[PDB]
């Protein structure tokens, strides 16, 4: 029942919502919204409204919004603060949905589509006519069909109209069985020209007005262009038809050495899945060209195309258009298991923001903190104008490039939010300041406790201990929320299993699936009910269980991303609650914190190992540190361990039982030194890494900051069967290095870490030959200027080939894109890739 918005805009003096109603039907109300801001007043007019600082405030109901906007403008020149939520769309949605929004992703119309263009150059250019618009395939999460748009003729190109039956080939490599599955959905209706099929879309657009329009590089290419063109044909006015509000705006975004132009369709939410991938897929590939990401996520590079890029149009259409579907379908395939759309929806309706605002954490949090405070009759302060000034970032230890046999890492649990809580930092919690000594003096516990009554920071900031902070409070809120949903997930999960156990030998009867909440372990009186259950209902339930476990996941991943981004705002000037004194306080604390545990660790480890001065901590990067546990190994002595697991158990036993506890007393003291509010610095073992037992493996090495690799045998309690090669930024899969070469480097590292300098030298040999005889192009470099003489140069002419495929020269084409790389890893690891002609040996004794 309860309704919910779809999109909301502020065209003019009224909000232009767009929602699903009570009956669950899409609509589009208009509202001369009357926003209310606030203003300070004497404790004489005293009401029920206050600012985070406790000052009593007063409401101010405005006629229209512009009436309110200008109030601010005035109040600012005047010199007084204008409290309250100045982003009306936010305020509107807030009043309009004074409750926890439950949405029906079904009723939401998600449209996926891409653009097919042609030109005598290759790379078309949006904001220009020349719309040859080869093809266009739109999608619609409701009808569940693909609406392909073909162009049989026009001014340039013609003939060969798509072949539904002829699914781009068969028994070959020019078909890819594009329509792999389900054909009830492909709807070929191209009318046989562009002059009309370029407009037909509009009539279509109105029959299925897009709510969420994501596709690949749609925010920069398709839409921005698919708007420009039509404009110059049917006129600007008849170009804003892509906007359910006829309305539209442009926003140029400058880049490094170049710049493009983005167009916005009011009343719509464009989520460039690419940008949705960049942000919610923590991998950050080399070049997201979707002829790789796909080959990554779905594990296959397809279409097996053979033709001249840029000119392929004349080539075919039975194989051309077939692309303009698998494309608009592969993007759909990824989201199927990535769920970034579902992620985004679950964020927005939680924030109470425009769904396309998940790309903006400053806003997302602003909303969230706003609503939390609104409920308490508290008034969000006014966003000031601060000068952008940089502040100390994280602490990365300059490691000593070398090799490290055994190593144990200890990462710190969500440090920057935790630091915020422990210290209890917030605009209003600020208590005062103190004679601040050199950061390292605090690190070494030599400076004098900063305060006896306030929670402090290495930078000189003091905060109230007996008083919750707006910010800290909200993070603890979101944090408990992740803990909350995760539990649902775990139970739905555990429930599903109970169901799966009951699928073997189900009762042979006709019945129905039970009405139960999967977020809670089934009671005894359902564990039973379920058995008798029939096998048509169980399978139904197991789906439901999953529908839950999964809904739980997403719902708690967002709470995570939410936490991991707060600091990313709190340090941003545009953020209402931003404050340098506190931006710094947070970081410089995290600074003292890492270096402090670094100490305490070395200190404790030295002792245990009966020595002094040895730096066991080889290096940390922000929140985690890596500890060399070689000496602790020897204490038991290498030769004694049944196998590799034995050692790992040992190193885990230790540091589960000996280190972490030494680590907490370490932090507990720091809590007390800084007279913090509550100790929340929780460092825990992460990865245990080393060389197989009996192996001449180096174990793991470091060549620089955030540049290394380890042979991990266990991560956060989970022991692996086959080691894992964590490889932190050594330039392997480099976008300019042939996959063949790439894989070698990976092997090189593996072998070094496992199986030693000898093995490395063997493989380095195999691959040197294995390289001398590869393919034509593949190893080839690739650049360009404008065009090439009458691929770009090679293709082959069979005049120059003979001479080229005999005068190339892998010598350079190798010791340039493998050897150079390798050199760095091996030098730091203190090894050689090819047995160096010994020297001292000649000094035979």
Q: How far is the CB of 303 from ligand GDP (least distance, A)?
A: 52
Nearer to ligand GDP, 59 or 208 (CB): 59
Contact segment (CB under 6 A) with ligand GDP among 376-384, 652-660, 718-726, 785-793 equals 376-384
Hey, what's the torsion of the CAs at 292, 302, 116, 340, to 10 degrees?
Answer: -50
Token pair listed for 368: 């969230």
Nearer to ligand GDP, 35 or 590 (CB): 35
| Backbone phi, psi, residue 426, to 5° | -170, 155
Given 379, 462, 555, 655, the residue binding ligand GDP (CB under 6 A): 379
Output b/e per residue, 659-690; b: 16+ Cβ within 10 A: bbebbbebbeebbebbbbbeebbebbbbbbbb
Nearer to ligand GDP, 370 or 404 (CB): 370
12 vs 350: CA distance, rounded Å: 26
Q: Which of 578, 585, 579 is nearest to 433 (CA)?
A: 585
| Backbone phi, psi, residue 185, to 5° | -95, -30
Q: Is the dihedral of CA 298, 299, 301, 302 positive or negative?
A: negative
Question: Residue with structure tokens 């719509």?
Answer: 268
Q: How far is the CB of 91 from ligand GDP (least distance, A)?
A: 4
20 part of the interface to ligand GDP, by CB under 6 A = no
Contact segment (CB under 6 A) with ligand GDP among 114-122, 125-133, 371-379, 685-693 equals 371-379
Nearer to ligand GDP, 94 or 243 (CB): 94
699 part of the interface to ligand GDP, by CB under 6 A = no
Nearer to ligand GDP, 85 or 601 (CB): 85
Which residues have C-beta within 8 Å of that of residue 361, sequence separation ≥ 6?
Answer: 565, 566, 568, 569
Q: How far is the CB of 70 from ligand GDP (least distance, A)?
A: 16
Token pair listed for 606: 């030295």
Given 82, 85, 133, 688, the residue binding ligand GDP (CB under 6 A): 85
Contact segment (CB under 6 A) with ligand GDP among 158-166, 221-229, 236-244, 374-382 equals 374-382
Q: How far is the CB of 50 from ligand GDP (least distance, A)?
A: 9
| Backbone phi, psi, residue 374, to 5° | -50, -50
580 vs 564: CA distance, rounded Å: 19
Q: How far is the CB of 68 from ligand GDP (least distance, A)?
A: 9
CA angle 89–10–100, rounded 5-degree value = 25
- 25-84 positions binding ligand GDP, by CB under 6 A: 35-36, 48, 84
Q: How far is the CB of 76 from ligand GDP (least distance, A)?
A: 17
Nearer to ligand GDP, 68 or 108 (CB): 68
Nearer to ligand GDP, 75 or 535 (CB): 75
Nearer to ligand GDP, 54 or 120 (CB): 54
Q: Where are the beta strands (DSSP E) in 531-641?
A: 617-621, 624-628
Contact 793, 719 (CB under 8 A): no
Q: Max Cα separation, the chain?
A: 99
Nearer to ligand GDP, 96 or 209 (CB): 96
Which residues have C-beta within 8 Å of that of residue 474, sequence separation ≥ 6?
Answer: 368, 369, 372
374 part of the interface to ligand GDP, by CB under 6 A = yes
Distance from first CA to last CA of the chain, Å, rounded? 92
DSSP, res 579: -
Contact 83, 72 (CB under 8 A): no
380 part of the interface to ligand GDP, by CB under 6 A = yes
Contact segment (CB under 6 A) with ligand GDP among 372-380, 392-400, 602-610, 805-813 equals 372-380
Q: How far is the CB of 547 from ligand GDP (least distance, A)?
A: 35
- 91-120 positions binding ligand GDP, by CB under 6 A: 91, 95
Nearer to ligand GDP, 87 or 297 (CB): 87
Q: How far is the CB of 71 from ligand GDP (least distance, A)?
A: 12
* Binding footprint of ligand GDP, residue count (CB under 6 A): 14
Contact segment (CB under 6 A) with ligand GDP among 176-184, 370-378, 459-467, 823-831 equals 370-378
Nearer to ligand GDP, 38 or 626 (CB): 38
Nearer to ligand GDP, 380 or 456 (CB): 380
Nearer to ligand GDP, 85 or 151 (CB): 85
Hey, what's the torsion of the CAs at 727, 731, 732, 736, to 10 degrees?
Answer: 160
Q: How far is the CB of 95 from ligand GDP (least distance, A)?
A: 4
Which residues have C-beta within 8 Å of that of residue 502, sequence separation ≥ 6?
Answer: 530, 531, 533, 538
Q: How far is the CB of 84 from ligand GDP (least distance, A)?
A: 3
562 part of the interface to ligand GDP, by CB under 6 A = no
Cross-strand bridge partners of residue 39? 58
Q: Which of 252, 249, 281, 283 is nearest to 268 (CA)?
A: 249
Long-range contacts of 795-802 (CB under 8 A, 24+ apart): none
Q: Counting every residue, how long is the chain? A: 845
Site string for ligand GDP, 118-137 (x = CB under 6 A): --------------------
Contact 424, 638 (CB under 8 A): no
Contact segment (CB under 6 A) with ligand GDP among 218-226, 378-386, 457-465, 651-659 equals 378-386
Q: Which residue is nearest to ligand GDP (CB)?
A: 84
Contact segment (CB under 6 A) with ligand GDP among 3-11, 366-374, 438-446, 615-623 equals 366-374
Nearer to ligand GDP, 95 or 672 (CB): 95
377 part of the interface to ligand GDP, by CB under 6 A = yes
Per DSSP, helices labelled H in 63-209 are: 65-78, 88-96, 200-207
Q: Which of 341, 137, 320 is nearest to 226 (CA)?
A: 137
Given 133, 373, 408, 555, the residue binding ligand GDP (CB under 6 A): 373
Q: Which of 311, 713, 390, 313 is nearest to 583 (CA)?
A: 390
Q: Which residues bind to ligand GDP, rule: CB under 6 A?
A: 35-36, 48, 84-85, 91, 95, 370, 373-374, 377-380
């Amino acid at each position: 029942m309860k309704e919910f918005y779809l999109t909301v805009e502020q065209i003019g003096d009224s909000i232009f919502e767009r929602y699903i109603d009570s009956n669950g039907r899409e609509r589009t109300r208009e509202v001369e919204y009357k926003p209310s801001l606030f203003a300070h007043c004497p404790e004489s007019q005293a009401t029920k409204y206050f600012d985070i600082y406790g000052k009593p405030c007063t409401r101010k109901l405005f006629a229209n919004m512009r009436d309110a906007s200008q109030w601010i403008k005035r109040m600012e020149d005047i010199g007084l603060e204008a409290l309250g939520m100045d982003d009306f769309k936010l305020a509107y949605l807030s009043d309009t949905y004074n409750y926890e929004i439950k949405y029906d992703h079904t009723k939401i119309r998600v449209a996926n589509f891409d653009i097919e263009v042609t030109s005598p150059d290759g790379f078309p250019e949006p904001s220009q006519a020349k719309h040859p618009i080869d093809a266009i395939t739109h999608y619609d999460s409701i009808d569940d069909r693909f609406y392909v748009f073909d162009l049989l003729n026009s001014p340039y190109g013609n003939v060969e109209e798509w072949s539904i039956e002829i699914a781009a080939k068969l028994q070959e490599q020019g078909g890819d069985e594009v329509p792999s599955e389900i054909i009830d959905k492909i709807i070929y209706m191209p009318f046989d020209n562009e002059k009309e099929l370029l407009m037909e879309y509009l009539n279509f657009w109105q029959q299925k007005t897009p709510v969420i329009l994501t596709g690949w590089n749609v925010e920069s290419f398709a839409i921005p262009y698919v708007y420009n063109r039509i404009k110059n044909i049917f006129g600007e006015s008849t170009a804003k038809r892509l906007s359910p509000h006829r309305k539209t705006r442009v926003k140029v975004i400058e880049n490094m050495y170049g710049s493009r132009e983005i167009i916005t369709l009011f009343g719509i939410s464009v989520l460039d899945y690419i940008d949705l991938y960049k942000k919610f897929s923590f991998t950050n590939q080399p070049s997201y060209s979707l002829d790789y990401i796909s080959e990554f996520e779905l594990n296959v590079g397809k279409l097996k195309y053979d033709g001249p890029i840029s000119k392929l149009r004349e080539s075919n259409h039975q194989r051309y258009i077939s692309y303009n579907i698998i494309a608009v379908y592969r993007v759909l395939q990824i989201d199927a298991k990535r769920q970034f759309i579902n992620l985004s929806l679950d964020m927005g309706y939680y924030a109470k923001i425009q769904i396309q605002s998940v790309f903006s954490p400053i806003k997302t949090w602003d909303a969230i903190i706003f609503n939390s405070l609104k409920e308490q009759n508290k008034v969000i302060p006014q966003g000031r104008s601060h000068p952008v000034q940089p502040y100390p970032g994280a602490f990365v230890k300059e490691p000593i490039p070398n090799r490290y046999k055994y190593v144990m890492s200890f990462d710190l649990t969500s440090l920057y939010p935790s630091i915020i809580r422990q210290v209890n930092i917030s605009p209003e919690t600020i208590a005062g300041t103190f004679k601040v000594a050199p950061l390292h003096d605090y690190i070494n516990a030599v400076a004098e406790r900063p305060s006896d009554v306030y929670s402090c920071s290495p930078n000189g900031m003091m905060y109230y201990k007996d008083r919750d902070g707006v910010v800290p409070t909200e993070i603890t809120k979101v944090f408990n929320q992740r803990k909350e949903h995760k539990g649902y997930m775990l139970a739905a999960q555990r429930n599903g299993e109970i169901i799966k156990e009951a699928l073997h030998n189900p009762n042979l009867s006709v019945d129905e699936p039970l009405d139960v909440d999967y977020r809670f372990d089934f009671s005894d009186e359902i564990k039973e009910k379920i058995k008798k259950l029939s096998a048509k209902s169980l399978n139904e339930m197991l789906f439901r269980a999953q529908r839950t476990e999964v809904a739980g996941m997403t719902a708690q991943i967002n709470r995570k991303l939410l936490i991991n981004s707060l600091y990313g705002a709190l340090g941003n000037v545009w953020f209402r609650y931003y404050d340098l004194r506190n931006a710094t306080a947070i970081t410089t604390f995290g600074q003292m914190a890492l270096q402090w545990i670094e100490r305490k660790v070395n200190e404790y480890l030295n002792e245990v190992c009966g020595t002094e001065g040895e730096a066991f901590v080889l290096y940390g990067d922000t929140d985690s540190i890596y500890v060399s546990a070689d000496k602790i190994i020897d204490k038991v002595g290498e030769s004694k361990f049944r196998d590799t697991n034995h050692w790992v158990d040992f190193l885990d036993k230790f540091a589960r039982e000996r280190m972490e506890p030494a680590i907490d007393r370490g932090f507990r003291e720091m809590c007390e030194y800084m007279n913090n509010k509550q100790h929340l610095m929780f460092m825990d073992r992460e990865a245990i890494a080393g060389p197989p037992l009996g192996s001449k493996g180096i174990g793991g090495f470091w060549t620089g900051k955030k540049r290394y690799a380890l042979n991990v045998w266990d991560m956060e309690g989970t022991r692996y069967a086959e080691p894992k090669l964590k490889i932190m930024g050594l330039e392997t899969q480099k976008s300019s290095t042939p996959k063949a070469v790439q894989k070698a480097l990976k092997e090189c590292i593996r072998r070094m870490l496992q199986e030693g300098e000898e093995s490395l030298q063997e493989y380095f040999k195999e691959f040197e030959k294995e390289f001398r005889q590869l393919n034509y192009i593949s190893i080839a470099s690739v650049s360009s200027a404008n065009n090439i003489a009458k691929p770009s140069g090679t293709e082959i002419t069979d005049l120059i080939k003979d001479d080229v495929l005999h005068w190339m020269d892998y010598t350079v084409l190798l010791e340039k894109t493998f050897i150079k790389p390798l050199e760095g890893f091996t030098s730091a690891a203190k090894l050689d890739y090819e047995k160096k002609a010994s020297l001292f040996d000649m000094f035979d004794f």
